[PDB]
UniProtKB/Swiss-Prot annotation, chain A:
Residues 1-365 are extracellular. Disulfide bonds join 53-282. NMDA is probably regulated by C-terminal phosphorylation of an isoform of NR1 by PKC. Its phosphorylated state is influenced by the formation of the NMDAR-PPP2CB complex and the NMDAR channel activity. This is Glutamate receptor ionotropic, NMDA 1. Glycans are attached at residues 35, 177, 213, 250, 274, 324, 342. The chain holds residues 27 to 391 of 938 of the full protein.
Length: 365, 237, 217
């Protein structure tokens, strides 16, 4: 019943301690006897991996939590902990990164998160497209690694919608010669700009479009969670659709939601039989966790009746539960908002969608 | 050395004068008692009366000691009041409120070798009470194009009838989490209506002005309860 | 969002590395606002330095980057500063908080915290309190003749307040100039009625923040 944790900032450690101290038995009905422990992340990736391999798997932990922004790998992803704990089918909570490539179950056996990856963002964009009949759209994704998976998911969903897009290919990561493709898109069906790149890779496209006065009516800009922050708000046109998921921005709320999900998973595991401990990773031990596929099934293949989010219909991939969205608009950096996605269908809010074209009704998309 | 000359003439809320009576000034106009209590129960009673030489530094007249030691009238100042008192209680009831008796009485410590100051309560108008109010203007002067091209602009708002203590800087623009966009700029005060002047060096560049929707400020003072804010959009060069 | 208590040290060595207590207690720092120090000095305008990212990028101006190395502390969510060679113009009220990009208008205070480059010099001595007795035989027009007589203590950047200030019925701002000798005598007095004179004395509560001298009488 021992549970571990691996954070870097002191605030995350304090929040985890408070979460495991108070309101830890509220999730469910069984009186749990978990032994919560936390390990501070090392500045070096090898030393931290060694500490993980000598502490977590040796103490027979069931789940972890990685949510610190300043990762020691300088890539904003928990690489060593995941590569060390993937052998024992340990559900490495990679809620600190949104990379859709790492969320795939191909190269990562047990790697879940509570943050919508690029695949979930593309799914939400596709769901918003079919509402206003946005079939012929263009994709200006400049990123390659995750952009390939993004455009693959986009084209597969378009084929599943009995249709086919026109531009689903990439040109160059962070280029400045997009004038030709922009002039070609000036005489296309829809001006819906689909950009799912990084900070600088999207800022380059934003400034290149601003240099060509690409801020007319009908340009629906679909951004992600970490695409407009710090300085990308000025380069992007005023009125972008800024997607934001509940307990995704706040670190404390995200950690609380992750702890609640872990508690619900432990309770569901204790409800059934075959309650075995993972093999202790000592010297010479190369044993595989027997309850690995069953744990994956009770994590992603099953549903959750309670928890922090209090929603149902959990995704079959362990990426993010389909729930209500908090999509806020950024008209001149104000508190305006647009139609949010409520898990199953977009429901308009009190104030309607404001468009950068000048009007508030359906633009000339 | 313990008390030097401050920026303005009145002590104000945060003033370096401990011998002051009123925060801003006394509510005296003409022919009424204006007691300038400069009581100081410090180590100045060196076997006799406490030395207290109060003087004025009005613009145009050099600082001249009115009464030395608060006991004997100094030859050179016309007898226009009754300045007496021994120990710590100093009787300085200034009943005649004329154009000459409307300066900051700098109560200098006679037992202190370095020239000290005191008082500061100028006998002028005080529009800070319930009936006496002060409402400045509400027109916002648009910043010049040169200040916008130079990066560091200055959105100076027109404030004429206000006091240094009445500096409403708490703004509220669509829940803007910022800290620091102006200062408490003041100028010389007038004996007619206390005409001050407020300015603001708020930096506003081309990009910042481009990503700017409204400029609804808050000029709510004790007298100007309903200020007409000028929430203009971009392009007001 | 109002828990950003800007604490400025007043006992730092002159022309040395200034480490301002940039207390950031609130929303998570995820490169949302402009966390930088505003140099508001009388005589020159404020210069926009830059901002910090979620993990630390030091996106400040290239001019004040070599001799001004801005640090980042994500563990305690309270980063320090390394302002070396604090000159006369550098000594001013800084605003180390979050700023929304766009310059729409600040909701915080407009005074700041002056980081005075001072030490255990003659400017800060033992507060010599005096037995100020309220004289009932005094009528200063419509106001009273209260106040305190605390001298020879911490200069202007001290945090002297009224007797348990919770209402602040007269605690306003006032532009003042620093004294050459440093023996400041700031006596904050609220607007009290004339009837309050003699019945109850009001002595300012001189509270030294960097010196921890809670002596007032």
């Amino acid at each position: 019943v021992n549970i571990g944790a691996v954070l870097s900032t002191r605030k995350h450690e304090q929040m985890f301690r408070e979460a495991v101290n108070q309101a830890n038995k509220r999730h469910g009905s069984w009186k749990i006897q978990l032994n919560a422990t936390s390990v501070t992340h090392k500045p070096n990736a090898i030393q931290m991996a060694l500490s993980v391999c000598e502490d977590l798997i040796s103490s027979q932990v069931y789940a972890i939590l990685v949510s610190h922004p300043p990762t020691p790998n300088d890539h904003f992803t928990p690489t060593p902990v995941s590569y060390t704990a993937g052998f024992y089918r340990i559900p490495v909570l990679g809620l600190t990164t949104r990379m859709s490539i790492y969320s795939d179950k191909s190269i990562h056996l047990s790697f879940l998160r509570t943050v919508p990856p690029y695949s979930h963002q593309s799914s939400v964009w596709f769901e918003m497209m079919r509402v206003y009949n946005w079939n012929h759209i263009i994709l200006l994704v400049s990123d390659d690694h995750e952009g390939r998976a993004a455009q693959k998911r986009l084209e597969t969903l378009l084929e599943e919608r009995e249709s086919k897009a026109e531009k689903v290919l990439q040109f160059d990561p962070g280029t400045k010669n997009v004038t030709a493709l922009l002039m070609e898109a000036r005489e296309l069906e829809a001006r819906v700009i689909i950009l799912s790149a990084s900070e600088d890779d999207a800022a380059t496209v934003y400034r290149a479009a601003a240099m060509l006065n690409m801020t007319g009516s009908g340009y629906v800009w679909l951004v992600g969670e970490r695409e407009i922050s710090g300085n990308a708000l000025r380069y992007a046109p005023d009125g972008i659709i800024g997607l934001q998921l509940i307990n995704g921005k706040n670190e404390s709320a995200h950690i609380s939601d992750a702890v609640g999900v872990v508690a619900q998973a432990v309770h569901e595991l204790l409800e059934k039989e075959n309650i075995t401990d993972p093999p202790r990773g000592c010297v010479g031990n190369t044993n595989i966790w027997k309850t690995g596929p069953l744990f994956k099934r009770v994590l992603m293949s099953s549903k959750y009746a309670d928890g922090v989010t209090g929603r149902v219909e959990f995704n079959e991939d362990g990426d993010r539960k389909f729930a209500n969205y908090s999509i806020m608009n950024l008209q001149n950096r104000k508190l305006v908002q647009v139609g949010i996605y409520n898990g199953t269908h977009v429901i308009p809010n009190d104030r309607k969608i404001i468009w950068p074209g000048g009007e508030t009704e359906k633009p000339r998309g | 050395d313990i008390q030097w000359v401050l920026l303005l003439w009145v002590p104000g809320s945060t003033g370096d004068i401990v011998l002051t009576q009123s925060p801003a000034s006394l509510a005296v106009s003409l022919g009424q008692r204006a007691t300038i209590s400069c009581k100081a129960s410090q180590s100045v009673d060196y076997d006799g009366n406490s030395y207290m030489n109060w003087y004025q530094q009005k613009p145009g007249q050099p600082p001249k000691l009115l009464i030395y030691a608060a006991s004997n009238l100094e030859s050179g100042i016309p007898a226009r009041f009754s300045g007496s008192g021994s120990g710590t209680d100093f009787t300085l009831n200034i009943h005649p409120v004329e154009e000459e008796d409307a300066a900051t009485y700098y109560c200098q410590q006679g037992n202190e070798d370095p020239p000290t100051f005191g008082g500061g309560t100028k006998l002028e108008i005080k529009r800070a009470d319930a009936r006496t109010v002060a409402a400045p203007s509400v027109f916002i002067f648009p910043p010049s194009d040169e200040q916008l091209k130079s990066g560091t602009a200055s959105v100076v708002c027109l404030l004429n009838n206000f006091y240094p203590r009445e500096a409403k800087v708490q703004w509220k623009v669509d829940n803007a989490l910022q800290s620091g966009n102006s200062q408490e700029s003041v100028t010389e005060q007038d004996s007619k209506d206390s005409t001050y002047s407020l300015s603001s060096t708020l930096t506003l560049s081309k990009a910042d002005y481009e990503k700017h929707k409204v400029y609804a400020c808050e000029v709510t003072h004790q007298g100007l309860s309903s200020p007409v804010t000028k929430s203009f959009n971009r392009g007001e060069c | 969002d109002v828990q950003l208590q800007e604490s400025g040290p007043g006992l730092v060595k002159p022309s040395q590395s200034l480490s301002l207590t940039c207390t950031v207690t609130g929303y998570s720092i995820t490169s949302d606002y402009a966390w930088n120090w505003i140099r508001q000095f009388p005589g020159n305008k404020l210069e926009w330095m830059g901002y910090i990212s979620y993990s630390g990028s030091t996106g400040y101006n290239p001019s004040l980057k070599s001799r001004i190395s801005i640090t980042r502390d994500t563990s305690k969510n309270q980063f320090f500063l390394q302002l070396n060679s604090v000159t006369t113009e550098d000594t001013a009220t800084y605003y180390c908080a979050r700023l929304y990009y766009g310059f729409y208008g600040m909701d915080y205070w407009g005074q700041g915290t002056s980081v005075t480059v001072s030490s255990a010099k003659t400017t800060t001595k033992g507060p010599s309190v005096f037995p100020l007795a309220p004289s009932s035989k005094s009528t200063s027009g419509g106001t009273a003749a209260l106040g305190c007589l605390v001298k020879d203590y911490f200069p202007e950047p001290v945090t002297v307040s009224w007797n348990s200030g919770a209402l602040t019925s007269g605690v306003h701002t006032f532009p003042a100039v620093l004294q050459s000798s440093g023996l400041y005598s700031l006596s904050s007095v609220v607007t009290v009625p004339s009837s309050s004179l003699g019945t109850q004395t009001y002595i300012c509560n001189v509270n030294h923040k960097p010196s921890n001298t809670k002596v007032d009488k």
